[PDB]
Structure 1
């Protein structure tokens, strides 16, 4: 038994503005109002003009995947429009956009505890995904969305974010997602700096193989950096599982003096 995307009557949707474009099509912001329920803001993804039947199927499959998930740190699917043209995917609206862009616009504006809260949320969403045997493959701050309450949610259903065995052997697992998560931790604590800075992809691959790992971001707690290092263990089986990452973050949040050493 699988979940399926609810069909939304097109009359319940009001598109307000286009907010993003790409190869897939457009993303818009808008309102969803169904009879008897309060209006909410939504994101509306539309497939590019002139799409084929195959493109329509692949597009809606993203909705089918998303519809299997129900977790506060995974983007919520409101439904789809498939009875009318063009096809649309309707998801919860995330006021603050992508996490990488959000942090770069707010450099140094949050407390360590707020940043750790963001990471805990992402970790919780990834525990849920990995619990369901879903491997993301593209976990990065650009693929995390942020709401008005600073809640971070995994979306998007790249060499320097990728585990060395996934690059070298095409072995993608939740353990390679854990490597990526460590890079996301570094992005968060650095307010969206580019991992490995100006190093080229070839320089990154070689450095990682020789034992190089990213340093703590400026003023980053040593405990958080050690967790990054754990996520970047060379052997994938030595990395913490997402459940362990979340538990460690909960312990850091519960015992905030643990974050004092930098």
Structure 2
């Protein structure tokens, strides 16, 4: 049972804003003092909203991985709250931007590798994420990121054209996420209209090698962007390859 007694939660400052309401950090005192994130819901006084909001908790409950944000529990009476593990440093994109000149390449590669472990886990669970992007990743510490929870510019051609979503289309999106990370949180296809993306991809064009990105790593990104989904690596292979790239970079 994930129902948490409200008296065990101390609501702290706002740390972000989601689909349903502000998100706060806070403290959960249980059998103590545990930093947590508290997701609120402006309109959960209505059951139709409440049901959708709490669906997030039901989804996250299914997963247990060190690189996926964990559900701690919920409070289902107004005001409805979802209590999640706190990823204290917040959204990855802003994190990468503020630390553009301070995060070493080994750390950026580490973040990609950690994400691939989470994604290989999801693929093994036969779960298709559909929205892999740096905006959906949270930063727990300088050495730990976790997956949170149309984005045409992140989407695989088969997803844009035919609404096909599989672990392979996730791999494509992850390729764009890795590019984002190595670009310090710049979004892909800046200045390009969404409707023009597919045209460039079909032309064979791809996001360019980020400055200072190891060629072996950029090569991995391009493999994620094979047009034919069957030719892309599986996540477990990206995990394996990212491990070696990370180790090589740690070696300097």
Query: Above 0.5 in TM-score?
Result: yes
For residues 47-62 of structure 1, what are the structure 2 equivalents within 5 Å?
47-49=41-43, 51-62=45-56
Q: After TM superposition, list the pairs within 5 Å mapping 1:177-188 onto structure 2.
A: 177-188=170-181
Is the 8 Å Cα contact of residues 45 and 78 (structure 2) preserved in structure 1? no
Aligned pair count reads 251
CA apart distance, 1:114 = 1.1
Residue 43 (1) aligns with residue 17 (2): no
Matched residue, 2:96: 103
Alignment of 1:55-204 (within 5 A): 55-82=49-76, 84-156=77-149, 158-204=151-197
Structure 2 unaligned spans of 5+: none
Structure 1 equivalent of residue 23 of structure 2: 27
2:145 and 2:202 map into 1 onto residues whose CA distance is 31
Q: CA RMSD in A?
A: 1.6
How big is the shift at 1:22? 4.1
What corresponds to 1:247 in structure 2?
Answer: 240
1:255 aligned counterpart, secondary structure: helix
Q: Do structure 1's residue 8 and structure 2's residue 4 form an aligned pair?
A: yes
Q: Are 1:223 and 2:216 matched, yes or no?
A: yes
For residue 46 of structure 1, report the CA deviation from its aligned partner.
Answer: 1.2
CA displacement at 1:244 relative to structure 2: 0.2
Q: Secondary structure, in 3 states, of the residue corresponding to 2:84?
A: strand
- State the alpha-carbon separation in 2 of the partners of residues 180 and 63 from structure 1: 24
Which digits, 9 at most, give the CA deviation of each residue in 1:205-244, with x for residues without a partner? 2100110011110111100100000000000010000000
Please report how far the alpha carbon of residue 21 of structure 1 lies from its aligned counterpart in structure 2 after TM superposition: 2.8
Structure 1 unpaired stretches of 5+: none
Distance of aligned partners of 1:196 and 1:53 in 2 relative to their CA distance in 1, 3 Å threshold: same
Q: CA separation in 2, counterparts of 1:194 and 1:23?
A: 21
Q: Is the 8 A contact 1:23 1:48 kept in 2?
A: no
Q: TM-score, normalised by structure 2?
A: 0.95
Distance in 2 (CA, whole Å) between partners of 1:40 and 1:94 is: 12
SS at match of 1:217: coil
